[PDB]
Amino acid sequence: TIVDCGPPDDLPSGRVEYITGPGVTTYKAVIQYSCEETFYTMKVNDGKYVCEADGFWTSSKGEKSLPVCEPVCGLSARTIYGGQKAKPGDFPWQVLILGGTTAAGALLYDNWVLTAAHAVYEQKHDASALDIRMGTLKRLSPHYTQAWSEAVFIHEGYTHDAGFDNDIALIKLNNKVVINSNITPICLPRKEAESFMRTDDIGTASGWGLTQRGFLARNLMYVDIPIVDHQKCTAAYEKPPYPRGSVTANMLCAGLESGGKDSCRGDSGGALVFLDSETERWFVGGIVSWGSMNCGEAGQYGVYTKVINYIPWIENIISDF
Numbered sequence: 535t536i537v538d539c540g541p542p543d544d545l546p547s548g549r550v551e552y553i554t555g556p557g558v559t560t561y562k563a564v565i566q567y568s569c570e571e572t573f574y575t576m577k578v579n580d581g582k583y584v585c586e587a588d589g590f591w592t593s594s595k596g597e598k599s600l601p602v603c604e605p606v607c608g609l610s611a612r613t614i615y616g617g618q619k620a621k622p623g624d625f626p627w628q629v630l631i632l633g634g635t636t637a638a639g640a641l642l643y644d645n646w647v648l649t650a651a652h653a654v655y656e657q658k659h660d661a662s663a664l665d666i667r668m669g670t671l672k673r674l675s676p677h678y679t680q681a682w683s684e685a686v687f688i689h690e691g692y693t694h695d696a697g698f699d700n701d702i703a704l705i706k707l708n709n710k711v712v713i714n715s716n717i718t719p720i721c722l723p724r725k726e727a728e729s730f731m732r733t734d735d736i737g738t739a740s741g742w743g744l745t746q747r748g749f750l751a752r753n754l755m756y757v758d759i760p761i762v763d764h765q766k767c768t769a770a771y772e773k774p775p776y777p778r779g780s781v782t783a784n785m786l787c788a789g790l791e792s793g794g795k796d797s798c799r800g801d802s803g804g805a806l807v808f809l810d811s812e813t814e815r816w817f818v819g820g821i822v823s824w825g826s827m828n829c830g831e832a833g834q835y836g837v838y839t840k841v842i843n844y845i846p847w848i849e850n851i852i853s854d855f
């Protein structure tokens with residue numbers, strides 16, 4: 535009359551292995567879950583489950599739910615105006631988004647893309663699936679990893695063509711991307727990531743947007759730029775033709791007084807990344823949002839969506855879908 539927990543549930547990006555015996559799922563039987571460990575790490579459990587008296591597989595912590603295989607994030611082979619050419623593995627989360635004008639995003643997990651709302655607003659509201667490409671440095675190459683949007687979430691505080699407050703969006707991909715050295719997600723900022731995002735701290739913008747030549751780049755470029763004091767950045771946009779209060783608390787600014795280093799038209803949606811020097815992992819602190827019309831203009835800093843403000847929103851959507 536012994537209870538049978540049956541076959542273990544499927545562990546996405548993982549595997550079930552029988553400890554007691556091949557295919558034995560009766561009371562007291564033990565199994566071990568593991569992840570594809572090169573690119574994924576097991577979270578919330580050590581993966582040891584046992585058949586309980588109630589017919590359920592339960593962890594060492596007594597949880598009825600599965601462990602989670604989570605893509606390793608923030609790896610880089612490092613360890614756009616006035617920049618230089620990226621190398622393979624430099625920005626493996628970098629995503630190209632087509633359909634409208636050139637835009638970009640950053641891979642999260644193995645099935646989400648973080649981008650700017652302004653970059654995808656028109657396409658989403660024309661009910662057109664987004665053509666999403668990764669694993670390539672060359673914008674116009676026929677060789678890339680193809681993904682397709684299943685859903686686009688635009689922040690509900692964003693108002694298209696009326697300022698860039700809340701300029702953030704999430705794309706759910708219809709399939710998991712195969713994670714490798716050339717394709718890995720960026721890390722979301724942890725609580726204390728602000729300690730690496732103070733005035734004068736260095737972030738990196740990457741993209742295929744306009745260079746100093748005034749044309750899009752064929753190959754992925756990047757620049758390191760300092761975070762700019764918020765009041766200083768606010769004052770820089772306190773003039774025509776900008777509407778009052780264009781720079782908000784949901785934005786950070788980055789760039790030089792001289793304009794020598796900047797993100798431009800076409801860089802939209804890209805992640806402004808920073809290095810957590812303690813974990814040695816890169817994370818996304820900003821999204822390429824807006825700036826003055828002319829790229830690399832002196833005294834007109836690039837303005838980025840302040841990603842850390844949207845962690846609850848991001849976690850709400852990713853957890854719920």
Ligand code: NA
Pocket residue numbers: 825826827828829830831834
């Ligand atoms: Na500008």
